[PDB]
């Protein structure tokens with residue numbers, strides 16, 4: 001029922017909280033949870049592994065059937081599939097992996113997919129092992145997304161750095 005609580009309001013449409021996106025999905029039952037996906041939808045590690053494990057592998061079985069018939073996504077692209085027990089829908093979004101040389105300009109394209117949904121629970125795109133500068137990813141979110149986005153960042157030091165840098 002989109003009952004988000006305990007988020008800091010950064011802008012009129014962007015909110016942020018130090019929390020695990022899986023625990024937020026369980027508490028909130030959002031209409032849309034965003035997965036930090038890769039092009040073949042292999043939900044190993046990071047956000048994707050955590051969401052998939054919380055569905056008892058249902059998300060991986062559904063995603064393998066999608067890829068068999070439709071093929072891989074593009075960097076900056078997205079795919080709406082079932083949200084299983086975590087949300088009504090899961091929006092799988094592929095941000096660029098700059099640790100693998102993918103272009104950081106495609107992070108704006110990745111965030112643009114959020115504009116199709118009125119309200120979303122999401123992670124910080126291209127952060128962690130994808131290698132983008134997290135402060136930059138937050139600025140791209142704030143500049144690109146017009147709909148209501150609730151960012152869950154599961155790392156207190158990173159959350160504090162993002163908040164302090166934005167509040168300058």
Ligand SMILES: CC(C)[C@H](Nc1ncnc2[nH]c(-c3cnn(C)c3C#N)cc12)c1ccc2c(n1)NC(=O)CO2
Pocket residue numbers: 019020021022036045046047050123124125126127128129130152153154155158
């Ligand atoms: C910057 C990070 C703090 C952030 N991670 C997270 N952000 C929010 N909720 C989270 N839950 C978990 C969790 C829950 N259980 N487990 C075992 C995990 C893991 N791993 C992790 C997580 C993050 C955002 C975007 C990402 C990635 N990581 N990593 C990637 O490979 C791709 O893109």
